[PDB]
């Protein structure tokens, strides 16, 4: 059934391309929901779907369609494909370039649900290998929007999208820690200010993400270190050392360690 649905979807997308016909959109809706339902929690189904290169080649092109519901469904499908994927599936997902088309599409996404799906799929993919982080950092206007989701005022008061944005920023900040340009465009929007406040946040996931980012950015540069020193990060980073959650503890301790090595002299 899964293979039959994937085959029908890929042949439809090949024989019609990017079309605005309503019936084709509804058929692709059915197919996408079917794949998301069928691939949920099935490693074998995920591997089978990721073995079909034509399927995901058809899928990635759908991100550029005018219907944002198609964007959201393709994002969910790529989410469940990238979640705990094996080496072959991760490499195959990287090959079809889903990262670039997903993250470009997020800039054009207007609906909250579609943006949540796309950013969550990016968060799942961003931990696979450093190449995904490279593609994320290489899109024009990429980091300037990644920082913009931290201060997102959600319509339904949900913290899913901000959690996704913090996770992506933590994942991709390793390359942000090596080049001055990315750090500069981060400073242009006062990213550290929104990162420090995330330590006091209502959600524990947000605190873990902020600790990871503070670990990554504060290392190996004087300017961000003294900027964090001016805003008093040392007090809240020291208070978070003994946390029960592993990621929070390591992030806070390491960030305080990097700040400690640069005391005024």
């Amino acid at each position: 059934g899964l293979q039959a649905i994937a085959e029908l979807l890929q042949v439809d997308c090949e024989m019609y391309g990017l079309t605005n016909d309503h019936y084709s959109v509804t058929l692709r809706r059915y197919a996408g929901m079917a794949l998301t339902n069928l691939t949920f929690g099935d490693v074998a189904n995920k591997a089978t779907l990721c073995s079909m290169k034509g399927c995901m080649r058809a899928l990635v092109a759908q991100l550029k369609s005018e219907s944002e519901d198609l964007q959201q469904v393709i994002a969910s499908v790529l989410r469940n494909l990238s979640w705990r994927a094996d080496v072959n599936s991760k490499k195959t997902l990287r090959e079809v370039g889903s990262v670039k088309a997903l993250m470009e599409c997020a800039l054009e996404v207007k609906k909250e649900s579609t943006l949540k799906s796309v950013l969550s799929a990016l968060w799942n993919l961003s931990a696979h290998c450093t190449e995904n982080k490279a593609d994320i950092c290489a899109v024009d206007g990429a980091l300037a929007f990644l920082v913009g989701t931290l201060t997102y005022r959600s319509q339904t008061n949900t913290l899913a999208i901000i959690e996704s944005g913090g996770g992506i920023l933590r994942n991709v900040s390793s390359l942000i820690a090596t080049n001055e340009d990315h750090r500069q465009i981060l400073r242009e929007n006062n990213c550290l200010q929104t990162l420090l406040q995330h330590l006091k946040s209502h959600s524990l996931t947000i605190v873990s993400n902020a600790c990871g980012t503070l670990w990554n950015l504060s290392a190996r540069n004087p300017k961000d270190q003294e900027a964090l020193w001016d805003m008093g990060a040392v007090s809240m980073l020291k208070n978070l050392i003994h946390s029960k959650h592993k990621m929070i503890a390591m992030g806070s301790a390491a960030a305080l360690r990097n700040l400690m090595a640069n005391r005024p002299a």
Binding site: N157, T158, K200, H202, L204, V207, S243, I248
Partner: protein
């Protein structure tokens, strides 16, 4: 409908008993002043149906015998 009302009343009674017990525990642990201070740092999210506690990441929650020295 009588059985439904009786079950609803029983649920009310159980919930009241449980929350009274919880207030008991909160009285023997947390003072009233800091019960009030805590209530100013918590918010209700109706969409998710759960509380929100700011700074949720800051809450509190030789005599062995050794005779090995004898040999050089």
């Amino acid at each position: 409908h009588q059985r439904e009302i009786e079950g609803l009343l029983e649920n009310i009674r159980q919930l009241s008993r449980e929350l009274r017990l919880q207030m008991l525990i909160i009285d023997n642990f947390i003072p009233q002043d800091y019960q009030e201070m805590i209530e100013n740092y918590v918010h209700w999210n109706e969409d998710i149906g759960e509380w929100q506690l700011k700074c949720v990441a800051y809450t509190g929650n030789p005599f062995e015998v050794d005779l090995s020295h004898v040999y050089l």
